[PDB]
Symmetry: D2
Subunit: 285 residues, 4 copies
């Protein structure tokens, strides 16, 4: 028969960490998933749980570690969780932690931030994935997800192959809408702020996508826009070792009103839930 992979853990452990400096409260809410691989496989083979750390104990441990070490950075948290299970149990040979941060934002009005009120603001969501082998260092990925953006021009698609199944007319203008998924690996020898990096890749992604605020910038391809973001990210940020990106192309099609004796192109568009294009790529150094 033979084994290829094993893993058990707890998913969707949710936590809100609160810090109080007088009237000024700070929060971090996360959802966490933890998987462990054991050296023994007798749990699978015979039903012997004597090496099993109960998933309930994994959940408690995430809660405790958040209390003892706080969160501060989601990457730090996951490293601490990994570090904890590799140190405390010698038959634990691999740990993996995924963390997603709820996009809470401090209330803001007329330039002043509220001391203890927050509004849920999913304008890009920070997540991370840390994996660590027994007696090896941790590999850290950070990422953006759930960032939804739409520009009404400076996008075109032309010069493509036209086979017997191609009805797509070429265009110099179209809507470009997407939901960014962007995941990058870090090198090593750390020295990364993590939170500052994340803000930076996000700043870039939104730059390559929308360009200068007065003129904007034409993109001839979703593929190009993707690759540009990647190159500019590995440039402005040395500690990143690779980047995976996935861009849906969410369609807003011109509604043909010919059959009604009307001319639209292109003021009324149909937003389609599906299907959608999906352009992906991963580059490294």
């Amino acid at each position: 028969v033979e084994f290829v992979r094993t893993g058990y853990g707890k998913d969707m452990v949710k936590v809100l960490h609160i810090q109080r400096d007088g009237k000024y409260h700070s929060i971090k809410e996360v959802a966490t998933s933890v998987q462990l691989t054991l050296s023994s496989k007798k749990d699978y083979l015979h039903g012997d749980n004597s090496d099993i750390i109960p998933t309930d104990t994994i959940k408690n441990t995430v809660h405790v570690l958040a209390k003892f070490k706080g969160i501060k950075s989601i990457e730090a948290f996951a490293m601490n969780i990994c570090e904890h299970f590799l140190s405390s149990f010698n038959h634990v040979i691999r740990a993996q932690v995924y963390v997603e941060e709820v996009p809470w934002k401090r209330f803001e009005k007329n330039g002043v931030k509220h001391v203890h009120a927050f509004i849920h603001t999913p304008t890009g969501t920070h997540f991370c994935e840390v994996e660590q082998m027994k007696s090896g260092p941790p590999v850290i990925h950070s990422g953006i997800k759930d960032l939804k953006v739409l520009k009404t021009t400076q996008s075109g698609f032309e010069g493509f192959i036209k086979d017997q199944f191609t009805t797509l007319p070429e265009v110099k203008d179209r809507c470009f809408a997407t939901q960014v998924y962007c995941k990058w690996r870090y090198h090593q020898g750390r020295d990364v702020d993590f939170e500052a990096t994340w803000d930076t890749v996000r700043d870039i992604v939104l730059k390559k996508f929308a360009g200068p605020y007065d003129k904007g910038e034409y993109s001839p391809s979703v593929q190009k826009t993707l690759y540009d973001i990647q190159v500019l990210s590995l440039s402005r940020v040395p500690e990143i070792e690779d980047m995976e990106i996935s861009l849906p192309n969410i369609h807003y099609f011109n509604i043909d009103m010919s059959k009604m004796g009307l001319i639209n192109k292109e003021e009324v568009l149909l937003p389609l839930d599906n299907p959608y294009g999906k352009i992906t790529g991963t580059v490294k150094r």
Copy 2:
């Protein structure tokens, strides 16, 4: 078998309206539902479709009206849709239109707005409902939904009835998290977009209080009534207001059995169950 109520229509008609003033593009993406009641019931009784406006035709009409009359306000849009079907068809005795606007926001960095880039920003979602009888005026409700907010203090709950099933301790400090649903009917005398922003601001005012210190809330019922009161006064054309405040729980994780003293730095976000506090007040005053 006496008929009580009838209605047919099209749901989830999605439209993106794009207006182009030079390089400066403006959008409104909505999802629309339209219901009509007919005077004859022969379609129900016998299968006689001779009075039916096909729902497909209703969809086409939403698309067309979006082209010709634009999308100034979703309230305007829905009135247009209502008026069209009552005026154009003598056997249509009732029209009802629901519209929800996708929370797109123009890109911004340091106060400068992008000419054609938008980011999906669900920090309160504008919807509206218009109903109109044949030869009567249209009744307009407008509303807020999907506004999710959390404050980590200035909230308490005490002085309640303690029966034999009450294990809830009284508290002077707690998290308050909610998802606002707020729906108001208008009188007859209105800037819809301005009214909406205003009620929203009152809502966020009563929930979080002054940005320096906050404001104690002793009761979600109380916070609800204040918003209703501050709103009908500050906005005369509002005739009544319905509010629904979930109380989404963040419970302190008791770590006693593990030898830790938490209270109250690490909390558990619960998806369910949750409290639901609701109320409708009408004028006057």
Copy 3:
């Protein structure tokens, strides 16, 4: 200002009730929502919680009631919950409970039901709503939801109005797909087997939709199919006083392949998530049967 409506409660209280008769286990998992109206309004006006039953207590109470009276009918359950809050607290003037039952089904293979294994089977979901005023009786609604069905013919749509915005071709054959929502009120005087009723309305609904096996039955309108179900239900089931129905018309459109020099009609269809038609109606008992 003046008050029009108030209500507070706990939503999404979930419970699994397990009964064990030897090796033979039977379950019911529900999700419950409870709202109460108080006589006092001092909670809203001044922040005075002295008349408030904590929502946590409402939640605890639902758990306890499921333990004490069990839950053999979700309608029964909801009635018990209502009566509990009206009896135990005199300043509670209205109670409303919504209950939805998880469509668990006993494992079945080659004709035998398993003693304690269940498979989640959303082929129609039982829900109910009970409302009760202080010193009045309870009104009981039961319902079907989340029942999704598709027939590939015996449906047509023609003879409709064609204005300047009508591009819809008339048709004698089309796919009909829907997700049934069906909610009925009961009369009174009791004598109702809530669970027995529910299976039959579902039986009816599914009958009026697909007709006789082997041949099927033509539907000329979603509106017609809707009314028939209503009439046939108020007939076969005397204790029902009204019925509300909502039938989405979920579109499967022929994919036109002309532009590629191909002829489809009608073997490849496009399932649309939206938009969709929505045909609704409520009939009440006074006249008619059959």
Copy 4:
């Protein structure tokens, strides 16, 4: 900076195929995703779309192939899609197709099936994944998802490590509820009835989970139940080369009512949406 992997395609291409054999109609509704990798990267590097098959064209192709070729086997459909793009375009070096079938079931009462009525019945959902390199064979996975089951006994959990963070009491009886995800690769040189193989793996899954219908075989470990399914399946089906399983452990906790003066043990339980346990494993064959 250099490329590691690229791919582009269309997702969520939905199709309903209707075949009419007289009065007897048969359907298969699927949702399909297709990804292609190209040899040139000038689309990425420079904005040169001259090698791109438009994703709209990919969509059209799925529709057409569904029309000329059939569906029936979801695996067949995905291989066809793969075959088409590797054949028709030599600059396409990889094709990957994911297909999920909507769980429609013919109306039924005691074995009498309706000729054209179907009810949506998610009691196990068939999916498949086919991947293929240029001038290599297709690699085929099939799988089960969204199969949600609960047994109220014949499950226990004891003999585990109890550290200082362990408050979990050992138990000999408990609810076990899960949502099965099960994905297997096929060998090759396969004379495979995909639909039958799928029904076979599914009932093996349900067998090891619930045991005999009269009694109900005890499971001392979800890890154990997982391995049994993997083992019984590679045996009953030679053409399977490996199997991946993921079993959530969805919690139903006894509601402690002591603080209210009640003894509940254990007729009323709390269904928790999260967190949940997740037990996974992949075995291959020799």
